[PDB]
Write an enzyme that holds these catalytic residues in place. Structure first.
Site, PDB file in Angstrom:
ATOM      1  CD  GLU A   1      -2.691   1.162   2.585  1.00 22.30           C
ATOM      2  OE1 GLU A   1      -2.696   0.111   3.261  1.00 22.30           O
ATOM      3  OE2 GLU A   1      -3.396   2.153   2.866  1.00 22.30           O
TER       4      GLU A   1
ATOM      5  CG  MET B   1       1.537   3.872   3.757  1.00 15.34           C
ATOM      6  SD  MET B   1      -0.255   3.681   3.791  1.00 15.34           S
ATOM      7  CE  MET B   1      -0.700   4.842   5.079  1.00 15.34           C
TER       8      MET B   1
ATOM      9  CE  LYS C   1      13.070   1.463  11.937  1.00 16.38           C
ATOM     10  NZ  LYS C   1      12.382   1.355  10.622  1.00 16.38           N
TER      11      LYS C   1
ATOM     12  CG  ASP D   1       4.984  -3.676   4.002  1.00 11.41           C
ATOM     13  OD1 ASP D   1       5.727  -2.690   4.196  1.00 11.41           O
ATOM     14  OD2 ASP D   1       5.311  -4.646   3.285  1.00 11.41           O
TER      15      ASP D   1
END
Length: 270
Positions: free
Chosen positions: A93, A95, A142, A159
């Site tokens: 995906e 981002m 993180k 992911d």
């Protein structure tokens, strides 16, 4: 138009580089079923041993069947065997709204209601991973790997396809971030409490807008502090006593005395 196509024929690759690091190069991809842009990640086989490529091929077969609203989607992966390439492709995906680090570098104080909502969504994502059969450890938690989603300002952790590639020899020695690693994570075997440790360092980064163990200059100094129970310097910069109490319970050197995802979600602060 497109320069490559996934074996399933669902994803197309465009010769448009969106990012590049020491480990992977991200290209603009297109999902021909939903008509949204995706991340066409490529990793050259020279950075992965034969055993790592084989192990990732089996782990990715089950990771692409995993979905969660607070986890970046891992769509598909395969091996591109051609002259001049010889790489592993990962479709994830895309981002584009930045990470938590992106907005921690630009603002000083985070509202306690926002820190509570974001940490709870991270704990919900980890809870879903650790309760699977078999359990799944994220191993790459993180603030630089937690992404913002447009609607409602929800957060998603990185992911699992890219997260499991952080276990490889190349990633640990070139792009590794040891200041988020539990003391027992340096050993050959560890469990899901490692994610609880990294989550405590994430909340420490939200509550201070400062990188943990930033006083150290190399990984060896970070290892000696963590394996000797020496907390980072930014731990004392936490103004909220209750937030400082939760962080300590997550970064305790002994994993048996360390808090669990269950204890965090049942805590009054979350």
């Amino acid at each position: 138009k497109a320069v490559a196509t996934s074996p399933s024929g669902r994803f197309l690759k465009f010769d448009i580089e969106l990012g590049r690091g020491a480990f992977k190069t991200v290209y603009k991809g297109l999902d021909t079923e939903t008509w949204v842009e995706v991340a066409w990640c490529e990793l050259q086989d020279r950075k992965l041993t034969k055993a790592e490529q084989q192990r990732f091929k089996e782990e990715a077969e089950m990771l692409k069947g995993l979905q969660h609203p607070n986890i970046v989607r891992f769509y598909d992966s395969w091996e591109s065997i051609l002259k001049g390439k010889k790489c592993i492709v990962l479709v994830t995906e895309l981002m584009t709204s930045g990470t938590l680090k992106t907005y921690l570098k630009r603002f000083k104080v985070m509202k306690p209601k926002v820190l509570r909502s974001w940490c709870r969504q991270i704990l919900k994502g980890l809870q879903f991973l650790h309760t699977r059969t078999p359990p799944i450890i994220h191993r790459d938690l993180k603030c630089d790997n937690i992404f913002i989603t447009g609607p409602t300002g929800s957060v998603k952790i990185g992911d699992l396809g890219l997260a499991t590639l952080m276990r490889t020899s190349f990633a640990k020695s070139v792009i590794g971030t040891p200041e988020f690693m539990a003391p027992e994570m340096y050993e050959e075997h560890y469990d899901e409490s490692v994610d609880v440790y990294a989550f405590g360092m994430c909340m420490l980064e939200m509550a201070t807008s400062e990188y943990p163990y930033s006083e150290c200059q190399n990984a060896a100094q970070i290892y000696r502090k963590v394996t000797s129970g020496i907390k980072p310097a930014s731990f004392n910069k936490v103004t909220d006593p209750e937030v400082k109490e939760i962080i300590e319970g997550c970064i305790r050197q002994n994993k048996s005395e360390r808090l669990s995802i269950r204890d965090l979600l049942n805590h009054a602060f979350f």
